[PDB]
């Protein structure tokens, strides 16, 4: 994302692979996270892997 | 107040039951606030401080 | 004083993408809202979308939504539409005005405010 | 008829009021109260003549009033003299950080 201000947030755009409603046929699926509820995943250099 | 207009969004979670999401911001994004008037407050903090 | 100034007149073949620039002096250019708005021959004017200068944020209607792309570069107070696919019913002026203020605290995108227009240059798709 | 709807024009002598009315739904002209008034002629940018529903800016001579009503919003030009004659339109908010206009309304002074 892109807001380059630091006075206002933005949400985090995170996208993950869904246990759909027939289970084993995934489809993958977005939604807004404020930034309190996401972190890192790991201390790799990875910087786009996170958990809740 | 929270000025941002959020959208809602839905996803599946197994058989038969969904997890509401945020989908969408529409307009500006902008900040979270609260509002206290100073005229107020500068008298009761006083008033507390006699107490 | 504040005033805007944009780009020339110009002819252009079906087809191809244009590059319509607008600048604006006499205050903060990152404090005001830039709102696109297009009048084709006689026709009442159309309005395009607006642009965030101190963030960059954008939004079109629905029929504009994916055809034209809106920035601006805050280094020299100068905003820029890109009109792609251009059309022969893209035929009209195109105007650059000034919007609401802004604030941390509000949403006043939606404002239509246009408290000054520039003088509107020619886009003629034939 | 653009997006928003209005009378395409109507005379009138002078003293009189010739009143433009701007139509008309709920979700653009009777949810908010963001309803400004554009005057255009030929060969010219338009003018900025009303904001806010009832307010005027600067340099606009004050013969002008707006008003606002249900689903309609509408024009006053009280004391009409003949530098009113010209295109006339309306344009508010319309939700969703969308804005609409009006079709227009030439004005006459016989």
């Known amino acids: 994302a892109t807001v380059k201000n630091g006075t206002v947030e933005e949400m985090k755009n995170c996208s993950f692979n869904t246990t759909t409603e027939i289970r084993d046929k995934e489809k993958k699926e977005y939604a807004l996270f404020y930034k309190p509820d996401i972190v890192p995943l790991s201390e790799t250099n990875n910087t786009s892997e996170y958990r809740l | 107040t929270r000025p941002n207009n959020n959208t809602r969004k839905s996803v599946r979670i197994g058989p038969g039951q969904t997890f509401y999401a945020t989908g969408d911001i529409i307009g500006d994004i902008k900040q979270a606030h609260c509002n206290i008037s100073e005229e107020k407050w500068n008298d009761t903090l006083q008033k507390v401080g006699i107490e | 004083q504040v005033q805007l100034v944009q780009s020339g007149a110009e002819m252009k073949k079906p087809g191809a993408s244009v590059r319509v620039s607008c600048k604006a002096s006499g205050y903060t250019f990152t404090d005001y809202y830039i709102h696109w708005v297009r009048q084709a021959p006689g026709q009442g004017p159309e309005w395009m979308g607006w642009?965030?200068?101190?963030?960059?944020?954008?939004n079109s209607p629905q029929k504009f939504q994916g055809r034209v792309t809106m920035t601006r570069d805050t280094s020299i107070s100068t905003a820029y539409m890109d009109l792609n696919r251009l059309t022969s019913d893209d035929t009209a002026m195109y105007y650059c005005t000034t919007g609401g203020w802004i604030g941390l605290y509000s949403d006043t995108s939606g404002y239509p405010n246009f408290d000054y227009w520039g003088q509107g240059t020619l886009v003629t798709v034939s | 008829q653009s997006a928003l709807t209005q009378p395409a024009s109507v005379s009138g002598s002078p003293g009189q009021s010739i009143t433009i009315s701007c139509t008309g739904t709920?979700?653009?002209?009777?949810?908010?109260?963001?309803v400004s008034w554009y005057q255009q002629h030929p060969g010219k940018v338009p003018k900025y003549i009303i904001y806010?529903?009832?307010k005027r800016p600067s340099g606009v001579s004050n013969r002008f009033s707006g008003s606002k009503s249900g689903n309609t919003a509408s024009l006053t030009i009280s004391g009409l003299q003949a530098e009113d004659e010209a295109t006339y339109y309306c344009?508010?908010?319309?939700?969703?950080?969308?804005?609409?206009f009006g079709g227009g309304t030439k004005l006459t002074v016989i």
């Open positions: 709920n979700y653009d002209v009777g949810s908010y109260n963001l």
């Open positions: 344009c508010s908010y319309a939700g969703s950080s969308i804005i609409f």
């Open positions: 806010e529903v009832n």
């Open positions: 642009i965030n200068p101190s963030t960059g944020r954008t």
